Design a protein around this ligand. Structure first.
Ligand SMILES: NC(=O)C1=CN([C@@H]2O[C@H](COP(=O)(O)OP(=O)(O)OC[C@H]3O[C@@H](n4cnc5c(N)ncnc54)[C@H](OP(=O)(O)O)[C@@H]3O)[C@@H](O)[C@H]2O)C=CC1
Ligand SMILES: NC(=O)C1=CN([C@@H]2O[C@H](COP(=O)(O)OP(=O)(O)OC[C@H]3O[C@@H](n4cnc5c(N)ncnc54)[C@H](OP(=O)(O)O)[C@@H]3O)[C@@H](O)[C@H]2O)C=CC1
Ligand SMILES: NC(=O)C1=CN([C@@H]2O[C@H](COP(=O)(O)OP(=O)(O)OC[C@H]3O[C@@H](n4cnc5c(N)ncnc54)[C@H](OP(=O)(O)O)[C@@H]3O)[C@@H](O)[C@H]2O)C=CC1
Ligand SMILES: CCCc1nc2c(C)ccn(Cc3ccc4nc(-c5ccccc5-c5nnn[nH]5)sc4c3)c-2n1
Ligand SMILES: CCCc1nc2c(C)ccn(Cc3ccc4nc(-c5ccccc5-c5nnn[nH]5)sc4c3)c-2n1
Ligand SMILES: CCCc1nc2c(C)ccn(Cc3ccc4nc(-c5ccccc5-c5nnn[nH]5)sc4c3)c-2n1
Ligand SMILES: [Mn+2]
Ligand SMILES: [Mn+2]
Ligand SMILES: [Mn+2]
Lengths: 564, 564, 564
């Protein structure tokens, strides 16, 4: 076990969730820590503590009640919290993170009990350094920050968006083995445009409209200098759930000077491309053979498209040819050269072509090999679309990435039925196994951002990468695809099973670290002989640290009290 | 507003439920206490915090879940918790104490989250002093202690008994203004006979049978010494939920040397007598004039009868006259001279008489003016009993004290119906108002122990009474009955409204204090001018304290930084 | 030994002079306290520690430097400091207190290093309570307070007077076994009249003239309130080195409400009367037989005289007759009826007699059997006066109480020479033993206040006396006199030896405690069986406490970590 000799003693030690073991404290520990008597007189193994929590967990009636229970656990005993989470990652992920964390953010102001994370507001402009000073952990290696302007599919929840950094960093630890004590969740509160919350007597945020323009920009600037100043330039800064206009803009602004990335853009890209790469092992052809059609042309679609182009360039195809293989549809229709209401980023994919408004006709005209839904329009992949995709393609790739199930472009059932079982399918939300007439059962997987971010962070932090290139995300996509077995593919899965996420994260971190030492981008020296064991050594374990003083004798002659 | 200049700062301050205000911390408070940023950017008044708690409380689906919410609150923000309680004492008391705390204790080992109170076990024999060292508050004035052998009406729940001292002390504070910071809930774990808990892998207590005999006696001896030695002879020690045999033995053992009482014995006698005294103002005669028949002859019965005799003596009746006014019935029947299976204590009321077993006949024979049910046999005041009571008496006094209502000697509805509205009625457990055919509504009250202990503690402590005589309990009964208005009595109520209990507690303490100075038994000096103001000044307020450093300038001449 | 279980650990523990043992911490203590490595790797017994300190002490070149060394010691290791002191009380007393402390106070502003004691200024008026909150010890039982207006014979030293309360409390502990952690030295800074300090750039106090009048009076009132309110009414409050009018005035004002005394007045009275009482065992006659002449009629003379009168009334003489036995001489000369410049307090001894201004003739006129010098006029007991005293008395009682040596009414040498060895002599400042012409040596002792205050404080606090009557001082004088052996009296010693002082203090306290239970004035209950052992148990030892957690096992069955 890890040794960490605490100077804390008495009641206040029990109040630190990194020190507190509850009933797992032995008699010897309790007496030595001066807490003997503050706990009932029984001694639990971690397995006994897990049993208690699960029994409670099962007696609860909603996902929300389940979330509240686990969050109470997080704030009492960090190690037990992660022991529970990792005892069944597939069960607990959807409780502490999406989709449930969604309801928690809607209900954040109502249920606000024990705070988690650092709140920095626009009125602390010029004073961010001293806001940081309140955080009780000096050594921080990963930050997740939101301004709450675009939480999941729920829009502007302002300060209620604190649930996202908190639950995200939970997964950083549970999935990727980041040390939670080195993790810092942040919300930047500049106001909200959410009208209910402005009216709500219980709202915990700044009761004002969002501050915009160059004052916003200068506040974000200060946030970046203060954090990197205090925690070092190797501290990872991950943005989440910013508005569309800020997300790309800020990533572009900072990415070259700070150790930062944005999961809504780059993580989404990685995991989508990972699913494509896996699907290629079914179609048995190259990426350069594909024609990609995106329904949607937002953060998801443009991030994904950017990374596909990069994979195509890696395969040898020049950029301006790569781009021609990708078509976009937005709310105004197909993106083509000279259309009204194009942006500069949309314009890169504006190929010469007749304007088209209707998706079914777009499909019939473009005849994609791969059709990616990222528009949040439920049912968009209609019978005709699916019929057409199966007409044009042996094994049509169809990704219904919109979340949750209700917004999904089609179900697994509809996809497999209408394509007579030939579609290669993945989705944003889980769908049950589907059994086809011929008696095969298909297990369509989910392109979960959780395959990507935990291992990327671990990797980056472990070797001290100073910038996170888009190449890290391409390389990661390859690693993920690599973990899918032929048997998985023939089962219809494009992703490794969820329960292996801890292993996926390790392999992702391993590859990043090997690469950084290879190409001299690593900053942590001396270079480790064994990259595998080096990364493992940097992972947080759910086993309790020993915290007692190191006790040991000296030889009799020199240990004894001198008198005469 | 009260002061409290803490040295605590930063994260650990927020972990102290005595310092922590959560959102009620002003911006100046947060910045000054080095916690600015650990909380979301809104500043809430205490009422706004109350609304948040109450909205939460409301959406819960059981009293148990409501208990868990309030207990979580207690352990995060002690003032807010007490503000919640006192905002509707009649609504909250059944949730934090009886009957909900009963389920809490049953379930304590399953739902155990953060500890409250001090656990002292048989195996700490010889070390109790050092166990006391773990308690983080040095200044303790009130202790509630249990061995969990006889929790409410649920029997032996061993270490799970800890719910009782915690809930009991919450009522000390909420109902009587005892400072929670100065209160110590204690469980002595000597084992349990509870077979279910002994089998239960989750049980938090010692997994062994109860230690008996001298080993136990020596342990309690050391308990009393350690506690009074550390907290001083002025510190109140209240026994609760001991086995009846022990309860009486231990009170007898310690009452003359320590500041100790037993609420199951003495508080019960006090509140029953209080009801009787109130009833005398409807019957419009003397306690002297009554013939009392007790259904039951156990801890409740013998305690109440003892105090009745003392009230009779005080009226001017000699003991041996007093005594003949009280008859008891046990499981074997009427207590009569020379009957079998009698004890020394039941002997005091063994009058010369034919043995009888049937309560209806006993009733027809004794013809009491007052029938007091304390047998825990539901339905024992039958139709015939009620009929006879109302034929023998204009206004028959009928107390159905057995708890909960399902064990009550009769319901209020039956009592009022069969006595044709003539019975003066009180119960142990709440009954609904009853409306007579003449359109008058009667509101039978409850002889809630909560009318007695909060005020008695406040009194004993405020004036430094070294011992708690039985006369304290006679006095307290008189004070309670005196708070009942003629209007209340006309409404069938024998007790002051539960929502006034703060006031009732103050008046009880006023009287104890006034008495103590008068007959020179107080130990706090100098003697206060105005005894109401003095007691008032000893009571804990739910208002937040100010804990900011005291800041004030000096004249500039002597404040200047000297130079040369 | 004694146990004090601290939650302190690591560096800061070593900064607490009550926890810090330096090299006397064992290896196991160091490891357990998280300080192993902060000390060099040798383990010293207390005696080795004492040897180091004493070696340094003897290499220094002045008493002043010795003072600075021991004061540095007091501020790093309290137990070792007091071990050193007590190892040779006669040697160390004059270093930490008079006369060396006088130089310390004159130099206090220059040599100021680490603070000791609490500074409270007139500018803190209204805020005294909050000043008290800075003191890190909540349990306070003895306070010594000065305004620094009359320090020793060095007049007004303002804030530089802090040396007096500090040094005085050291003697409380060293001499009387008061717990130093329970003692609080205070200076009240209302300004100074000292022109050299007012002019000095380094002066540490308020650079202003003294606030007089009701502003002063109101300040002192708040002080008594705040201190009694925070520490309780049993907290001892000893006034020291106030101006003369203030001292009496303040003593009269508060003595009836507060547990307070003034050592300059009452301590002085007690020790001088102890000396007288001792001398009566040489002259083998009664106090009522004496004719007493005071050279001086200030604080010392009037307090001694008042206590003599009390002792005379105790022997059986009405006050009006006892008064006749005492003659005062002031700077205007013999005090008599009608005289100009008489305060109403001198009026108490203004007998019918003609004015006289020459001491020599006052002597030859009064023919006193005892002559007491408290006028601060060096050499006033001239050869002629001494010749007369020996002519008029077989054994003249002669007290040269003025301080220091240079202000003595006569030296031991001169007194013994001129009275040809028959004078019964004691002084305020120490003289060497004197070898007479017959070759016998006499050992005049010192009427040192140290004989009185440590034992008074011990007794008062031990039994919880709420006021300190003058009778305490009379009883105390008797006790000290009883400690002088006949053999000592034959050597010319009026006082028990300085190296037995702790025993004398024990005896003084025993008597106070016996008397207080005897006449029901004690407030600590229950009454101890054995008053001797009770006072002993209250005395601070110079032995180190054990501070390690109390560790002890439970039977293996219950101590076992529980699994499934
Ligand atoms: N790993 C995963 O499962 C992930 C899934 N997603 C899913 O992708 C979806 C979109 O996310 P994101 O890109 O961040 O959102 P954005 O809001 O950035 O983009 C939404 C895009 O949809 C376009 N659009 C809206 N209506 C239509 C329509 N009727 N037909 C065609 N296009 C339309 C918008 O058009 P315009 O440009 O005209 O406004 C915009 O281009 C969500 O459902 C989300 O759940 C996202 C990230 C990850
Ligand atoms: N403030 C309140 O409202 C309070 C109410 N109570 C209630 O009073 C009831 C008794 O509690 P407590 O005195 O502590 O309990 P005990 O067990 O000490 O006393 C019970 C008594 O009932 C007797 N009894 C049992 N069966 C019968 C029967 N068929 N006929 C007559 N007597 C019978 C027992 O007889 P034997 O001695 O032969 O066994 C015993 O004397 C409980 O229901 C409790 O809820 C108690 C305290 C306070
Ligand atoms: N235990 C001990 O050893 C103690 C010794 N002392 C010593 O006693 C001395 C006086 O102390 P204290 O009473 O506090 O001082 P005060 O200043 O209160 O008293 C001084 C007294 O001496 C008088 N005086 C001054 N000059 C003469 C003179 N020429 N002839 C006669 N009387 C004169 C003053 O007279 P007037 O009233 O006219 O001003 C005044 O009455 C100091 O030297 C002090 O060291 C004091 C306390 C304890
Ligand atoms: C791992 C691959 C990630 C990646 N690296 C990239 C580089 C270097 C360059 C370009 N992209 C594409 C990209 C990625 C995301 C994105 N969201 C946008 C957006 C979305 C909605 C609304 C407005 C805007 C908006 N419009 N204009 N500004 N903001 S536009 C946009 C472009 C990249 N993607
Ligand atoms: C406010 C007045 C309270 C009060 N002061 C009292 C004094 C001084 C003396 C006597 N009583 C009566 C009293 C009070 C309670 C009690 N429980 C008992 C008991 C209960 C159950 C089972 C066995 C026993 C049992 N049987 N024999 N021993 N234990 S017996 C018993 C007597 C008093 N009540
Ligand atoms: C153990 C005996 C204690 C004791 N109890 C006493 C009681 C109750 C009453 C009187 N004395 C005598 C006493 C004791 C000290 C003292 N200093 C004074 C003083 C000295 C110098 C200058 C002005 C004043 C001054 N003049 N007027 N006010 N201040 S006058 C004075 C009287 C007492 N001594
Ligand atoms: Mn997101
Ligand atoms: Mn009870
Ligand atoms: Mn002095």
């Amino acid at each position: 076990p890890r040794r960490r000799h605490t100077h804390q003693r008495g009641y206040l030690l029990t109040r630190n969730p990194h020190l507190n073991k509850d009933l797992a404290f032995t008699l010897e520990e309790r007496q030595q820590l001066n807490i003997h008597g503050l706990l009932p007189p029984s001694f639990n193994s971690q397995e006994i503590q897990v049993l208690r929590v699960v029994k409670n967990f099962e007696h609860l009636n909603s996902d929300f009640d389940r979330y509240l229970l686990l969050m109470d656990l997080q704030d009492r005993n960090e190690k037990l919290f992660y022991r529970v989470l990792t005892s069944d990652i597939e069960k607990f992920m959807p409780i502490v993170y999406t989709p449930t964390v969604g309801l928690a953010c809607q209900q954040y102001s109502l249920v606000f009990r024990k705070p988690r994370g650092l709140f920095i507001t626009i009125h602390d402009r010029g004073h961010i350094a001293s806001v940081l000073n309140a955080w009780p952990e000096d050594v921080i290696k990963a930050i997740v920050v939101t301004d709450g302007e675009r939480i999941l599919g729920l829009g502007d929840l302002g300060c209620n968006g604190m649930g996202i950094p908190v639950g995200k960093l939970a997964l950083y630890t549970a999935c990727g083995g980041m040390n939670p004590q080195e993790c810092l969740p942040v919300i930047l509160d500049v106001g909200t445009e959410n009208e209910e919350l402005l009216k709500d007597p219980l709202y915990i945020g700044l009761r004002q409209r969002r501050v915009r323009g160059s004052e916003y920009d200068d506040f974000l600037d200060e946030f970046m200098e203060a954090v990197s100043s205090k925690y070092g330039m190797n501290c990872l800064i991950q943005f989440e759930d910013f508005a569309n206009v800020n997300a790309f803009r800020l990533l572009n602004k900072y990415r070259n000077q700070y150790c930062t990335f944005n999961d809504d853009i780059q993580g989404t890209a990685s995991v989508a491309v990972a699913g494509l790469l896996a699907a290629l092992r079914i179609t048995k052809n190259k990426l350069s053979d594909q024609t990609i059609l995106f329904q949607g042309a937002g953060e998801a679609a443009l991030g994904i498209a950017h990374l596909i182009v990069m994979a195509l360039e890696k395969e040898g195809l020049p950029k301006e040819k790569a781009i021609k293989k990708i078509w976009l549809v937005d709310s105004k229709g197909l993106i083509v050269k000279g259309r009204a209401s194009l942006t500069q980023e949309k314009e890169k994919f504006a190929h010469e072509h007749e304007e088209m408004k209707n998706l079914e006709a777009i499909v019939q005209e473009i005849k994609p090999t791969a059709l990616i839904g990222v528009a949040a329009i439920g049912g968009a992949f209609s019978e005709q679309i699916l019929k057409d995709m199966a007409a044009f393609n042996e094994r049509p790739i169809i990704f219904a990435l919109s979340n949750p199930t209700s917004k999904a472009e089609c179900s697994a059932e509809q996809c497999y039925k209408i394509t007579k079982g030939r579609a290669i399918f993945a989705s944003g939300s889980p769908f049950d196994p589907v059994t086809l007439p011929n008696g095969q059962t298909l297990y369509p997987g989910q392109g979960n951002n959780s395959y990507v971010f935990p291992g990327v962070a671990l990797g980056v932090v472990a070797c001290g990468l100073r910038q996170i290139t888009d190449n890290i995300f391409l390389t990661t996509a390859e690693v993920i695809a690599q973990q899918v077995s032929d048997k998985h593919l023939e089962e219809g899965r494009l992703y490794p099973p969820l329960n292996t996420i801890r292993d996926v994260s390790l392999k992702i971190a391993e590859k990043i670290v090997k690469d950084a030492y290879q190409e001299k981008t690593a900053t942590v020296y001396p270079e480790p002989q064994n990259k595998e064991a080096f990364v493992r050594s940097q992972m947080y374990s759910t086993d309790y640290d020993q915290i007692l003083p190191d006790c040991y004798s000296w030889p009799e002659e020199v240990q004894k009290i001198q008198t005469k």
